[PDB]
Design a protein around this ligand. Structure first.
Ligand SMILES: [Zn+2]
Ligand SMILES: [Zn+2]
Ligand SMILES: [Zn+2]
Lengths: 285, 307, 108
């Protein structure tokens, strides 16, 4: 069934992500506060509340438990507020000031190659920061990548070194894939441009072992294209629009084993657009 | 105050030798069929056989258990000029495998026993030729390889010898060699062999001239005391002697007890860690138990028949 | 396996990843050696290399311990796993008699 949780915040909630097992349904709003609420056994308890930002908070993303119970908060104040829970209490642990504009989104690396909370700087670049242990986190930034600023950073899944990879997008009406080189400095490898308007969210689909990679890109024009590459060396993303959103497509999230692409737009509605046998995608909501 | 009981034990006929374990739940028997069997006492107390396997072509002379500090190990001595070291391994039924053996002796081995725990996992064997060789394998984790640490000749027919319980490094080690020669001339049926730490050798500390009668077995109890210990001789007349330590350190040997209630040649002797009981089994076929009293006087305490 | 782990069946993921082929990829980090029981040498393994004997003796049974073993990092004593579970189910002090309250000195 469905369990309803009251946000009880002075401002509208604008983000949400649950725990890996799922017990800790976090909420973030523009009230300069992101909190933690436990949801076990169909409950709603304000287990812990945090308040350490300056203005709105747009995103909240989690960590793999193998590196501990760690959150990640993005705020308009051009800062990242990492919160940990130690000894049953929540407390701030880190901060950054490496961005000249409001941080758009922050998403975590896949755990198989360490901890990296990559975030974008909404002027021309991003900020990749990998904790080096003993409270040492180092920020390595891009150099004038996006035209007006990246919007969402999507993390490529692991492959059989490690060949780090991720994708990003912004209001440049294009989506670009960014590949980290062996020397350690990221070098661009491809560029895709099909969105008639600003691109809001880019999502990378998780992998199960098949020889394919899929990306779902939202945009201000309302196009939800499932960019696919049937070969591991072709690098030829073949787009295929799935729907015509009336307003700007806001979010895009994929399923546990890459089945359903969740989308929410300006209609205050959620469409569970799942593909079909004939290659089309039809909403089953 | 003697109580005798009978338990449900499945066996064909008389066996060669038997042993037990400090845990109280493990026991072993070697039958005349040149096969090695193990019977384990259950939690309810019932003794359950766990293994049965042949040992060697020669008849199994004697069986000696090992110290729990070194692992589940059993020692076998064969009348075929060979000694067998077999270790039980369970993959869960057990499977006993002779991970090592010792056949350096040209003639049949009379007996072999485990040495003191304070000298490492070392053991010795004495054959009928009067030669006893002590082999000490440094590899506690690997029982396959054995190194012949020492060899000693008693110059008399050796049948049953027991290493002295002097284990602590605060003193020196000693070993008591027995004999069963039927020489018409009288001689020392026993001798005291103590290892010299400085000389790295064992020398005849003293030859027990007090024993000339045929001796079947030698038993010296564990000390666990203060001053010294005593030993026993299994012969026609059982006698107990106390050593009073003064090269090898001189000791004053004097009779502490003398019992002949069996009126036969004593074959096997009982064991008593407490030290207040000195019991032995004579050839009369009736179990003889004797113990010290409040007057520090050894006297017969219990008696039972073999049946 | 990484779906089962999220579900909450840590045993089941172990059974599934039993059948992977490519090594276990051993971890490199801090290792726990043992002072030997006879010659007091630091030996990294089940048996010493000088006296070739057992290096760890049980503080409860006073027998060689080879399988599962628990220890505290404070008082430097350990023993058999079941034996320490039995001993610490009731007591709050070191059956090695050193006075180290391991229940609070090793629960980190
Ligand atoms: Zn050692
Ligand atoms: Zn133990
Ligand atoms: Zn301790």
């Amino acid at each position: 069934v469905i369990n309803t949780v009251d946000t009880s915040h002075e401002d509208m909630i604008h983000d949400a992500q649950m725990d890996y097992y799922g017990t800790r349904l976090a909420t973030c709003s523009s009230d300069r506060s992101v909190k933690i609420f436990d949801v076990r056994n169909g409950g709603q308890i304000l287990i812990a509340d945090l308040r350490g930002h300056e203005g709105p908070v747009w995103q909240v993303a989690w960590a793999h438990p193998m590196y501990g119970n760690i959150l990640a908060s993005c705020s308009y104040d051009r800062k990242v507020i990492i919160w940990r829970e130690e000894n049953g209490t929540w407390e701030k642990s880190h901060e950054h000031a490496g961005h000249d504009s409001s941080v758009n989104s922050v998403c975590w690396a896949p755990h198989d190659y360490g901890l990296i909370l990559a975030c974008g700087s909404s002027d021309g670049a991003i900020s990749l920061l990998t904790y080096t242990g003993e409270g040492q986190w180092e920020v390595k930034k891009i150099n004038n990548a996006h035209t007006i600023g990246c919007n969402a950073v999507s993390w490529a899944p692991a492959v059989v070194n490690y060949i780090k990879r991720f994708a990003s997008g912004g209001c440049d009406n294009l989506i670009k894939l960014w590949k980290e080189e062996e020397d350690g400095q990221w070098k661009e490898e491809q560029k895709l441009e099909a969105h008639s308007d600003w691109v809001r969210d880019v999502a990378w689909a998780p992998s199960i072992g098949l020889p394919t990679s899929t990306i779902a890109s939202c945009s201000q024009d309302g196009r939800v294209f499932i960019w696919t590459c049937d070969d591991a060396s072709s690098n030829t993303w073949s787009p295929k629009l799935l729907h015509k959103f009336n307003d700007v497509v806001w979010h895009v999230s994929w399923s546990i084993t890459a089945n359903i692409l969740a989308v929410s737009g300006g209609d205050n509605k959620v469409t569970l657009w799942k593909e079909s046998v004939d290659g089309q995608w039809v909403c089953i909501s | 105050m003697f109580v005798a009981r009978s338990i449900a034990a499945d066996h064909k006929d008389l066996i060669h030798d038997v042993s037990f374990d400090f845990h109280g739940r493990r026991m072993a028997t070697c039958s005349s069929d040149q096969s090695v069997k193990v019977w384990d006492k259950s939690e309810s107390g019932d003794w359950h056989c766990t293994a049965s396997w042949k040992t060697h072509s020669g008849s199994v002379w004697r069986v000696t258990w090992a110290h729990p500090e070194f692992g589940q190990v059993l020692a076998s001595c064969s009348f075929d000029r060979t000694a067998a070291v077999w270790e039980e391994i369970v993959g869960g039924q057990s499977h006993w495998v002779k991970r090592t053996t010792l056949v350096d002796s040209r003639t049949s081995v009379t007996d072999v026993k485990f040495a003191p725990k304070h000298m490492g996992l070392m053991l010795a064997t004495c054959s009928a030729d009067g030669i006893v060789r002590i082999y000490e394998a440094p590899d506690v984790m690997n029982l396959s390889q054995w190194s012949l640490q020492h060899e000693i000749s008693c110059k008399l027919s050796c049948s049953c010898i027991s290493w002295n319980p002097s284990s602590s490094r605060a003193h020196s080690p000693m070993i008591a060699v027995g004999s069963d020669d039927s020489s018409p001339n009288a001689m020392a049926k026993v001798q005291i062999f103590e290892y010299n730490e400085n000389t790295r050798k064992y020398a005849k500390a003293e030859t027990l001239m007090t024993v000339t009668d045929p001796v079947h077995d030698i038993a010296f109890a564990p000390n666990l005391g203060r001053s010294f210990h005593i030993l026993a001789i299994a012969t026609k007349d059982v006698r107990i002697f106390t050593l009073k330590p003064v090269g090898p350190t001189k000791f004053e040997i004097h009779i502490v007890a003398q019992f002949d209630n069996h009126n036969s040649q004593v074959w096997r002797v009982s064991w008593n860690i407490t030290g207040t009981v000195l019991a032995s089994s004579g050839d009369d076929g009736c179990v003889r138990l004797w113990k010290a009293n409040y007057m520090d006087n050894w006297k017969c305490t219990g008696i039972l028949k073999g049946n | 396996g990484e779906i089962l782990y999220r579900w909450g069946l840590r045993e089941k993921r172990a059974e599934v990843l039993k059948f992977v082929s490519c090594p276990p990829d051993p971890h490199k980090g801090i290792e726990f050696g043992v002072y030997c029981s006879h010659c007091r040498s630091e030996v990294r393994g089940t048996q010493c290399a000088i006296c070739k004997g057992f290096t760890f003796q049980c503080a409860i049974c006073h027998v060689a311990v080879r399988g599962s073993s628990n220890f505290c990092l404070t008082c430097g004593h350990g023993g058999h796993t079941s034996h320490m579970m039995e001993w610490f189910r009731t007591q709050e002090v070191c059956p090695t008699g050193c006075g180290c309250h391991c229940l609070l000195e090793s629960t980190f």
